[PDB]
Amino acid sequence: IKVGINGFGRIGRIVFRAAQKRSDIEIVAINDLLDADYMAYMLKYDSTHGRFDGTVEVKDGHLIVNGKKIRVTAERGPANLKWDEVGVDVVAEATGLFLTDETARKHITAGAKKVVMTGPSKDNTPMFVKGANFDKYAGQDIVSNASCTTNCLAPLAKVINDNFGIIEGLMTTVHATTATQKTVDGPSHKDWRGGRGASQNIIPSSTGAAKAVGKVLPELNGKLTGMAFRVPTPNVSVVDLTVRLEKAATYEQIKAAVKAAAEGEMKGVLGYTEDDVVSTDFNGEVCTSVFDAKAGIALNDNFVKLVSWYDNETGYSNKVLDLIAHISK
Ligand SMILES: [Ag+]
Ligand SMILES: [Ag+]
């Protein structure tokens, strides 16, 4: 019910905005390498999600949003974050630098009770994706909500595998531009393609989302692998999943299966549309996976190609809040 945010990046700020529209969660503390008046500016104005729908003021180095006061730190050593001072139960860790158990444990060292990582773990801290494996949470004090792309692929793949059985799958995501790319051709020694100008290029990139699903859904372990293309669009991405099915199924049977999940057990997580949509039509979508019925194709009853959209910022942020609420129940 009381959360602290570490890191005010794209993910951190959208997590903050989505928390305002909720009754179960109240953010009380924020940490980043930036001043308070600057954070008030970055929260007030956004090129992708418009102006902030509320009040923001700076009073004595602290933020006041909708009348509630937020404590603003800046220390880069998580041990001295004094989480117990304002007394936070869960910490949403969005630096992208402490995706390890050793580093993340500095937070509950500082007086929090649990830690949720807004990225895929690099050790073997457990991962959880809503609709995929929230059932199997076992009370751990540090968790991960996987990647933007894994939150879109896993719910769809569970529905397809449980109805028809997946023998093998290859996926490709047409991914929107992120903060790790460059405006003009620049240096990037880990990924040479990634340093090229994002505004002018289709940039192939590797991704771990397809094999990451094998851990949140052990049934498809080693049955999927994937690849990405980064394109000059500010937001919203799309997944293209090519799979072989054990049990034969027409395309209408697949539509009906997905449609039933989106209106049934996976309402709010999985979405369904039969309209002539484009990427902008999902700017601000909350579901982490919207099936596009009309864009998929089927060669035969056992070889099919499914496409599904996701807002790589909005839907992911909303689901880490659902993960925070789920681990405090
Ligand atoms: Ag929806
Ligand atoms: Ag929704």
mmCIF file of C-alpha atoms and ligand atoms in Angstrom:
data_model
loop_
_atom_site.group_PDB
_atom_site.id
_atom_site.type_symbol
_atom_site.label_atom_id
_atom_site.label_comp_id
_atom_site.label_asym_id
_atom_site.label_seq_id
_atom_site.Cartn_x
_atom_site.Cartn_y
_atom_site.Cartn_z
ATOM 1 C CA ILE A 1 0.000 0.000 0.000
ATOM 2 C CA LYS A 2 3.075 2.247 0.361
ATOM 3 C CA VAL A 3 5.782 2.134 -2.317
ATOM 4 C CA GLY A 4 9.139 3.773 -2.988
ATOM 5 C CA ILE A 5 10.544 4.262 -6.492
ATOM 6 C CA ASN A 6 14.265 4.050 -7.279
ATOM 7 C CA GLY A 7 15.046 5.521 -10.687
ATOM 8 C CA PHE A 8 12.899 8.075 -12.520
ATOM 9 C CA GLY A 9 13.358 6.837 -16.080
ATOM 10 C CA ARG A 10 10.641 6.133 -18.610
ATOM 11 C CA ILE A 11 9.470 3.140 -16.560
ATOM 12 C CA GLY A 12 9.672 4.917 -13.205
ATOM 13 C CA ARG A 13 7.578 7.917 -14.233
ATOM 14 C CA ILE A 14 4.832 5.871 -15.903
ATOM 15 C CA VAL A 15 4.660 3.633 -12.824
ATOM 16 C CA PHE A 16 4.092 6.819 -10.813
ATOM 17 C CA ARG A 17 1.336 8.092 -13.120
ATOM 18 C CA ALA A 18 -0.543 4.783 -13.100
ATOM 19 C CA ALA A 19 -0.359 4.602 -9.297
ATOM 20 C CA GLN A 20 -2.320 7.855 -8.940
ATOM 21 C CA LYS A 21 -5.366 6.172 -10.508
ATOM 22 C CA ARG A 22 -5.374 3.422 -7.851
ATOM 23 C CA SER A 23 -6.838 2.964 -4.377
ATOM 24 C CA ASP A 24 -4.560 0.202 -3.058
ATOM 25 C CA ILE A 25 -1.138 1.809 -3.642
ATOM 26 C CA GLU A 26 0.319 5.119 -2.444
ATOM 27 C CA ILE A 27 3.814 6.160 -3.536
ATOM 28 C CA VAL A 28 5.643 8.146 -0.865
ATOM 29 C CA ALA A 29 9.309 8.227 -1.874
ATOM 30 C CA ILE A 30 11.433 8.611 -5.015
ATOM 31 C CA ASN A 31 15.184 8.398 -5.644
ATOM 32 C CA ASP A 32 17.228 9.524 -8.653
ATOM 33 C CA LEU A 33 20.298 11.534 -9.672
ATOM 34 C CA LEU A 34 18.211 14.637 -10.415
ATOM 35 C CA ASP A 35 16.893 17.739 -8.674
ATOM 36 C CA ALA A 36 13.298 18.082 -7.496
ATOM 37 C CA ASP A 37 12.229 20.921 -9.801
ATOM 38 C CA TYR A 38 13.619 18.919 -12.731
ATOM 39 C CA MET A 39 11.646 15.821 -11.729
ATOM 40 C CA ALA A 40 8.527 17.988 -11.439
ATOM 41 C CA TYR A 41 9.143 19.065 -15.041
ATOM 42 C CA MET A 42 9.748 15.536 -16.350
ATOM 43 C CA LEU A 43 6.524 14.400 -14.666
ATOM 44 C CA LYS A 44 4.432 17.396 -15.744
ATOM 45 C CA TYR A 45 5.273 17.167 -19.464
ATOM 46 C CA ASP A 46 5.621 14.046 -21.604
ATOM 47 C CA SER A 47 5.967 13.787 -25.381
ATOM 48 C CA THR A 48 4.239 10.384 -25.478
ATOM 49 C CA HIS A 49 1.537 10.484 -22.770
ATOM 50 C CA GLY A 50 0.642 14.187 -22.661
ATOM 51 C CA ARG A 51 0.490 16.544 -19.719
ATOM 52 C CA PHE A 52 0.174 15.161 -16.206
ATOM 53 C CA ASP A 53 -3.467 14.965 -15.110
ATOM 54 C CA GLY A 54 -3.103 16.596 -11.721
ATOM 55 C CA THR A 55 -1.139 19.022 -9.570
ATOM 56 C CA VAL A 56 2.651 19.137 -9.176
ATOM 57 C CA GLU A 57 4.504 21.625 -6.967
ATOM 58 C CA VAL A 58 7.925 21.759 -5.301
ATOM 59 C CA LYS A 59 7.932 22.720 -1.610
ATOM 60 C CA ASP A 60 11.271 22.746 0.251
ATOM 61 C CA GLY A 61 12.991 20.192 -1.963
ATOM 62 C CA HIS A 62 10.010 17.815 -1.944
ATOM 63 C CA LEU A 63 7.198 17.083 -4.384
ATOM 64 C CA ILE A 64 3.501 17.683 -3.701
ATOM 65 C CA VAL A 65 1.291 15.821 -6.196
ATOM 66 C CA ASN A 66 -2.478 16.008 -5.628
ATOM 67 C CA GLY A 67 -1.794 17.439 -2.174
ATOM 68 C CA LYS A 68 0.242 14.440 -1.007
ATOM 69 C CA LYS A 69 3.904 15.070 -0.212
ATOM 70 C CA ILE A 70 6.568 12.822 -1.756
ATOM 71 C CA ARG A 71 10.025 12.527 -0.206
ATOM 72 C CA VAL A 72 12.777 13.137 -2.776
ATOM 73 C CA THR A 73 16.235 11.626 -2.239
ATOM 74 C CA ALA A 74 19.297 11.453 -4.499
ATOM 75 C CA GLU A 75 21.746 9.100 -2.785
ATOM 76 C CA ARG A 76 23.269 6.465 -5.074
ATOM 77 C CA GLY A 77 24.036 4.032 -2.239
ATOM 78 C CA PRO A 78 20.846 2.035 -1.655
ATOM 79 C CA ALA A 79 21.788 1.100 1.921
ATOM 80 C CA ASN A 80 21.323 4.688 3.158
ATOM 81 C CA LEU A 81 17.980 5.121 1.369
ATOM 82 C CA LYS A 82 16.311 5.204 4.847
ATOM 83 C CA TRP A 83 13.278 3.311 3.525
ATOM 84 C CA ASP A 84 12.086 2.679 7.082
ATOM 85 C CA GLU A 85 11.906 6.424 7.844
ATOM 86 C CA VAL A 86 8.781 7.033 5.750
ATOM 87 C CA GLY A 87 8.152 3.282 6.129
ATOM 88 C CA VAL A 88 7.660 1.680 2.697
ATOM 89 C CA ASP A 89 6.582 -1.957 2.277
ATOM 90 C CA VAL A 90 7.619 -2.535 -1.354
ATOM 91 C CA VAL A 91 10.310 -0.846 -3.463
ATOM 92 C CA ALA A 92 9.987 -0.638 -7.252
ATOM 93 C CA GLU A 93 13.590 -0.782 -8.447
ATOM 94 C CA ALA A 94 13.938 0.706 -11.947
ATOM 95 C CA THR A 95 17.602 1.728 -12.273
ATOM 96 C CA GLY A 96 18.435 -1.169 -14.541
ATOM 97 C CA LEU A 97 21.654 -1.473 -12.514
ATOM 98 C CA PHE A 98 20.608 -3.638 -9.545
ATOM 99 C CA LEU A 99 19.013 -6.626 -11.298
ATOM 100 C CA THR A 100 20.894 -8.980 -8.950
ATOM 101 C CA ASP A 101 19.933 -10.417 -5.570
ATOM 102 C CA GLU A 102 23.037 -9.026 -3.849
ATOM 103 C CA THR A 103 22.448 -5.468 -5.061
ATOM 104 C CA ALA A 104 18.665 -5.490 -4.609
ATOM 105 C CA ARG A 105 18.931 -6.734 -1.012
ATOM 106 C CA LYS A 106 20.467 -3.382 -0.047
ATOM 107 C CA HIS A 107 16.878 -2.070 -0.147
ATOM 108 C CA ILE A 108 15.410 -4.319 2.578
ATOM 109 C CA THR A 109 18.711 -3.713 4.357
ATOM 110 C CA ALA A 110 17.487 -0.093 4.363
ATOM 111 C CA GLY A 111 14.113 -0.987 5.898
ATOM 112 C CA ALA A 112 11.762 -1.956 3.088
ATOM 113 C CA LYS A 113 9.934 -5.280 3.133
ATOM 114 C CA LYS A 114 9.984 -6.466 -0.509
ATOM 115 C CA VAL A 115 11.658 -5.540 -3.795
ATOM 116 C CA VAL A 116 10.189 -5.724 -7.306
ATOM 117 C CA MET A 117 12.624 -5.365 -10.207
ATOM 118 C CA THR A 118 11.182 -3.662 -13.299
ATOM 119 C CA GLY A 119 13.448 -5.716 -15.563
ATOM 120 C CA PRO A 120 14.536 -9.283 -16.269
ATOM 121 C CA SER A 121 16.814 -10.742 -13.615
ATOM 122 C CA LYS A 122 20.421 -11.600 -14.446
ATOM 123 C CA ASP A 123 20.893 -14.096 -11.635
ATOM 124 C CA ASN A 124 18.047 -16.517 -10.835
ATOM 125 C CA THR A 125 15.742 -14.228 -8.900
ATOM 126 C CA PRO A 126 12.263 -15.569 -9.767
ATOM 127 C CA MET A 127 10.278 -13.909 -12.538
ATOM 128 C CA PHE A 128 6.512 -13.414 -12.623
ATOM 129 C CA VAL A 129 4.195 -12.414 -15.479
ATOM 130 C CA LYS A 130 0.492 -11.827 -14.884
ATOM 131 C CA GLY A 131 -1.731 -14.504 -16.375
ATOM 132 C CA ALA A 132 1.383 -16.651 -16.853
ATOM 133 C CA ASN A 133 2.791 -17.582 -13.435
ATOM 134 C CA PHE A 134 1.372 -15.315 -10.744
ATOM 135 C CA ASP A 135 -0.263 -18.487 -9.400
ATOM 136 C CA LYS A 136 3.120 -19.898 -8.386
ATOM 137 C CA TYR A 137 4.410 -17.033 -6.209
ATOM 138 C CA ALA A 138 5.962 -18.550 -3.070
ATOM 139 C CA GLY A 139 6.440 -15.546 -0.793
ATOM 140 C CA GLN A 140 9.928 -14.462 -1.862
ATOM 141 C CA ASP A 141 11.125 -11.011 -0.813
ATOM 142 C CA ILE A 142 12.738 -10.137 -4.180
ATOM 143 C CA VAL A 143 10.985 -10.680 -7.521
ATOM 144 C CA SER A 144 11.163 -9.601 -11.159
ATOM 145 C CA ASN A 145 8.411 -8.723 -13.630
ATOM 146 C CA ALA A 146 10.436 -9.778 -16.714
ATOM 147 C CA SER A 147 10.652 -7.639 -19.859
ATOM 148 C CA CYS A 148 8.222 -5.531 -21.854
ATOM 149 C CA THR A 149 8.240 -8.160 -24.614
ATOM 150 C CA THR A 150 7.933 -11.176 -22.304
ATOM 151 C CA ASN A 151 4.809 -9.690 -20.709
ATOM 152 C CA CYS A 152 3.237 -9.720 -24.178
ATOM 153 C CA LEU A 153 4.399 -13.115 -25.454
ATOM 154 C CA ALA A 154 3.751 -15.258 -22.366
ATOM 155 C CA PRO A 155 -0.028 -14.727 -21.875
ATOM 156 C CA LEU A 156 -0.680 -15.389 -25.565
ATOM 157 C CA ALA A 157 1.594 -18.449 -25.647
ATOM 158 C CA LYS A 158 -0.103 -19.962 -22.584
ATOM 159 C CA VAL A 159 -3.513 -19.764 -24.273
ATOM 160 C CA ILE A 160 -2.185 -21.279 -27.502
ATOM 161 C CA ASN A 161 -0.261 -24.054 -25.751
ATOM 162 C CA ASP A 162 -3.072 -25.127 -23.414
ATOM 163 C CA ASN A 163 -5.654 -25.402 -26.217
ATOM 164 C CA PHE A 164 -3.566 -26.772 -29.099
ATOM 165 C CA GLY A 165 -0.031 -27.560 -27.879
ATOM 166 C CA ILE A 166 3.076 -25.860 -29.274
ATOM 167 C CA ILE A 167 5.725 -28.085 -30.833
ATOM 168 C CA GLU A 168 8.048 -25.218 -31.783
ATOM 169 C CA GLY A 169 7.940 -21.464 -32.200
ATOM 170 C CA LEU A 170 9.882 -18.560 -33.691
ATOM 171 C CA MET A 171 8.905 -14.992 -32.830
ATOM 172 C CA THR A 172 9.945 -11.556 -34.065
ATOM 173 C CA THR A 173 9.040 -8.269 -32.425
ATOM 174 C CA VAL A 174 8.922 -5.005 -34.351
ATOM 175 C CA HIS A 175 10.072 -2.877 -31.423
ATOM 176 C CA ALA A 176 9.693 0.861 -30.959
ATOM 177 C CA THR A 177 12.669 3.068 -30.151
ATOM 178 C CA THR A 178 14.004 3.056 -26.584
ATOM 179 C CA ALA A 179 16.347 5.274 -24.573
ATOM 180 C CA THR A 180 19.335 3.004 -25.326
ATOM 181 C CA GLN A 181 19.498 4.029 -29.006
ATOM 182 C CA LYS A 182 20.967 7.174 -30.558
ATOM 183 C CA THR A 183 19.649 10.040 -32.669
ATOM 184 C CA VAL A 184 22.627 10.071 -35.054
ATOM 185 C CA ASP A 185 25.338 7.447 -35.592
ATOM 186 C CA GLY A 186 27.096 7.040 -32.259
ATOM 187 C CA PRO A 187 29.250 4.704 -30.172
ATOM 188 C CA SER A 188 27.823 1.549 -28.599
ATOM 189 C CA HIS A 189 30.393 -1.196 -28.047
ATOM 190 C CA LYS A 190 28.036 -3.933 -26.810
ATOM 191 C CA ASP A 191 25.740 -3.764 -29.875
ATOM 192 C CA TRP A 192 27.212 -2.100 -32.963
ATOM 193 C CA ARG A 193 23.866 -1.971 -34.774
ATOM 194 C CA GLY A 194 22.265 -0.314 -31.731
ATOM 195 C CA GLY A 195 24.537 2.724 -32.008
ATOM 196 C CA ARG A 196 23.259 3.578 -35.473
ATOM 197 C CA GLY A 197 20.727 6.366 -35.939
ATOM 198 C CA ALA A 198 17.321 5.262 -34.700
ATOM 199 C CA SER A 199 15.359 7.863 -36.694
ATOM 200 C CA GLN A 200 16.633 6.489 -40.030
ATOM 201 C CA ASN A 201 17.057 2.724 -39.667
ATOM 202 C CA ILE A 202 15.446 -0.637 -39.217
ATOM 203 C CA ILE A 203 17.879 -2.015 -36.639
ATOM 204 C CA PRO A 204 18.004 -5.798 -36.075
ATOM 205 C CA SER A 205 18.592 -6.677 -32.442
ATOM 206 C CA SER A 206 18.827 -9.736 -30.240
ATOM 207 C CA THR A 207 16.326 -10.432 -27.483
ATOM 208 C CA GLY A 208 15.933 -12.897 -24.642
ATOM 209 C CA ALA A 209 12.143 -12.707 -24.357
ATOM 210 C CA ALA A 210 11.356 -15.952 -26.180
ATOM 211 C CA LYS A 211 13.670 -18.083 -24.040
ATOM 212 C CA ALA A 212 12.646 -16.152 -20.908
ATOM 213 C CA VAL A 213 9.085 -17.429 -21.397
ATOM 214 C CA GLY A 214 10.468 -20.950 -20.974
ATOM 215 C CA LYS A 215 11.138 -20.151 -17.301
ATOM 216 C CA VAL A 216 7.762 -18.605 -16.403
ATOM 217 C CA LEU A 217 6.054 -21.406 -18.386
ATOM 218 C CA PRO A 218 8.293 -24.485 -18.051
ATOM 219 C CA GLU A 219 6.150 -26.376 -20.584
ATOM 220 C CA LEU A 220 7.642 -24.366 -23.471
ATOM 221 C CA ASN A 221 11.231 -24.601 -22.205
ATOM 222 C CA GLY A 222 13.554 -24.668 -25.199
ATOM 223 C CA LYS A 223 10.582 -24.560 -27.594
ATOM 224 C CA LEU A 224 10.801 -20.856 -28.531
ATOM 225 C CA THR A 225 13.465 -18.414 -29.651
ATOM 226 C CA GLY A 226 13.236 -14.949 -31.104
ATOM 227 C CA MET A 227 14.652 -11.804 -32.696
ATOM 228 C CA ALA A 228 13.809 -8.111 -32.962
ATOM 229 C CA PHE A 229 13.674 -5.176 -35.369
ATOM 230 C CA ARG A 230 13.872 -1.653 -33.960
ATOM 231 C CA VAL A 231 11.987 0.909 -36.055
ATOM 232 C CA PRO A 232 11.669 4.750 -35.844
ATOM 233 C CA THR A 233 8.384 4.893 -33.943
ATOM 234 C CA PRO A 234 8.183 6.533 -30.499
ATOM 235 C CA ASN A 235 5.967 3.977 -28.745
ATOM 236 C CA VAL A 236 3.953 0.744 -29.087
ATOM 237 C CA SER A 237 5.427 -2.525 -30.383
ATOM 238 C CA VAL A 238 4.084 -5.696 -32.001
ATOM 239 C CA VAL A 239 4.972 -9.383 -31.643
ATOM 240 C CA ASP A 240 4.854 -11.829 -34.547
ATOM 241 C CA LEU A 241 4.701 -15.461 -33.406
ATOM 242 C CA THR A 242 5.176 -18.355 -35.851
ATOM 243 C CA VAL A 243 4.338 -21.704 -34.226
ATOM 244 C CA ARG A 244 3.589 -25.322 -35.075
ATOM 245 C CA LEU A 245 0.617 -26.935 -33.335
ATOM 246 C CA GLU A 246 0.283 -30.520 -32.129
ATOM 247 C CA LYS A 247 -3.513 -30.568 -32.491
ATOM 248 C CA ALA A 248 -4.920 -29.196 -35.738
ATOM 249 C CA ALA A 249 -6.904 -25.975 -35.406
ATOM 250 C CA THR A 250 -8.456 -23.624 -37.937
ATOM 251 C CA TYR A 251 -7.789 -19.910 -37.628
ATOM 252 C CA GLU A 252 -11.340 -19.310 -36.384
ATOM 253 C CA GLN A 253 -10.729 -21.802 -33.565
ATOM 254 C CA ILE A 254 -7.629 -19.816 -32.596
ATOM 255 C CA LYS A 255 -9.574 -16.544 -32.680
ATOM 256 C CA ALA A 256 -12.283 -18.073 -30.487
ATOM 257 C CA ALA A 257 -9.716 -19.449 -28.032
ATOM 258 C CA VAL A 258 -7.970 -16.082 -27.613
ATOM 259 C CA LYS A 259 -11.300 -14.234 -27.511
ATOM 260 C CA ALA A 260 -12.513 -16.524 -24.725
ATOM 261 C CA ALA A 261 -9.399 -15.889 -22.630
ATOM 262 C CA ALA A 262 -9.611 -12.112 -23.108
ATOM 263 C CA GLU A 263 -13.213 -12.139 -21.862
ATOM 264 C CA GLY A 264 -12.578 -14.830 -19.250
ATOM 265 C CA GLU A 265 -9.625 -15.639 -17.024
ATOM 266 C CA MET A 266 -7.259 -13.135 -18.676
ATOM 267 C CA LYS A 267 -9.507 -10.071 -18.866
ATOM 268 C CA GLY A 268 -7.375 -6.962 -18.434
ATOM 269 C CA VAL A 269 -4.189 -8.850 -19.363
ATOM 270 C CA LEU A 270 -5.021 -10.259 -22.807
ATOM 271 C CA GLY A 271 -6.901 -8.175 -25.363
ATOM 272 C CA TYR A 272 -8.751 -8.941 -28.593
ATOM 273 C CA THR A 273 -9.643 -6.821 -31.615
ATOM 274 C CA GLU A 274 -11.064 -7.405 -35.093
ATOM 275 C CA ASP A 275 -10.579 -3.805 -36.271
ATOM 276 C CA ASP A 276 -8.199 -2.121 -38.730
ATOM 277 C CA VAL A 277 -5.931 -0.812 -35.989
ATOM 278 C CA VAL A 278 -2.429 0.670 -36.187
ATOM 279 C CA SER A 279 0.269 1.174 -33.560
ATOM 280 C CA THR A 280 -1.018 4.578 -32.387
ATOM 281 C CA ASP A 281 -4.400 3.035 -31.544
ATOM 282 C CA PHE A 282 -2.708 1.322 -28.569
ATOM 283 C CA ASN A 283 -0.931 4.378 -27.138
ATOM 284 C CA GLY A 284 -1.899 4.050 -23.482
ATOM 285 C CA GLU A 285 -3.343 0.532 -23.661
ATOM 286 C CA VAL A 286 -3.389 -1.209 -20.286
ATOM 287 C CA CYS A 287 -3.581 -4.831 -21.445
ATOM 288 C CA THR A 288 -0.081 -6.214 -21.939
ATOM 289 C CA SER A 289 -1.161 -8.156 -25.047
ATOM 290 C CA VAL A 290 -3.812 -7.293 -27.660
ATOM 291 C CA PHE A 291 -4.438 -10.016 -30.239
ATOM 292 C CA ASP A 292 -4.887 -8.737 -33.811
ATOM 293 C CA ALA A 293 -7.345 -11.145 -35.420
ATOM 294 C CA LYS A 294 -7.313 -9.680 -38.906
ATOM 295 C CA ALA A 295 -3.520 -9.448 -39.312
ATOM 296 C CA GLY A 296 -2.626 -13.059 -38.496
ATOM 297 C CA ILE A 297 -2.257 -15.622 -41.269
ATOM 298 C CA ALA A 298 -2.488 -19.409 -41.455
ATOM 299 C CA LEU A 299 -0.791 -21.568 -44.066
ATOM 300 C CA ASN A 300 -2.494 -24.780 -42.899
ATOM 301 C CA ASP A 301 -4.218 -26.109 -39.780
ATOM 302 C CA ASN A 302 -0.861 -26.780 -38.042
ATOM 303 C CA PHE A 303 1.373 -23.853 -39.110
ATOM 304 C CA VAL A 304 0.139 -20.396 -38.122
ATOM 305 C CA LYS A 305 1.389 -16.844 -37.601
ATOM 306 C CA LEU A 306 -0.097 -14.731 -34.797
ATOM 307 C CA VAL A 307 0.423 -11.019 -34.169
ATOM 308 C CA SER A 308 -0.283 -9.049 -31.009
ATOM 309 C CA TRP A 309 0.340 -5.447 -29.960
ATOM 310 C CA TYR A 310 1.703 -4.037 -26.722
ATOM 311 C CA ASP A 311 2.524 -0.601 -25.339
ATOM 312 C CA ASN A 312 6.026 -1.309 -24.056
ATOM 313 C CA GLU A 313 5.660 1.388 -21.356
ATOM 314 C CA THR A 314 2.035 1.649 -20.210
ATOM 315 C CA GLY A 315 0.994 -1.995 -19.992
ATOM 316 C CA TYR A 316 4.257 -3.121 -18.410
ATOM 317 C CA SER A 317 4.098 -0.412 -15.740
ATOM 318 C CA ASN A 318 0.501 -1.298 -14.881
ATOM 319 C CA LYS A 319 1.481 -4.943 -14.391
ATOM 320 C CA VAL A 320 4.356 -4.300 -11.993
ATOM 321 C CA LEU A 321 1.762 -2.501 -9.867
ATOM 322 C CA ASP A 322 -0.385 -5.635 -10.085
ATOM 323 C CA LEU A 323 2.691 -7.632 -9.053
ATOM 324 C CA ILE A 324 3.279 -5.295 -6.103
ATOM 325 C CA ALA A 325 -0.336 -5.666 -4.995
ATOM 326 C CA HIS A 326 -0.168 -9.444 -5.460
ATOM 327 C CA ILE A 327 2.876 -9.929 -3.200
ATOM 328 C CA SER A 328 1.339 -7.929 -0.324
ATOM 329 C CA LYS A 329 -1.921 -9.916 -0.190
HETATM 330 AG AG AG B 1 -7.852 -4.458 -23.651
HETATM 331 AG AG AG B 2 -7.174 -3.674 -20.674
#
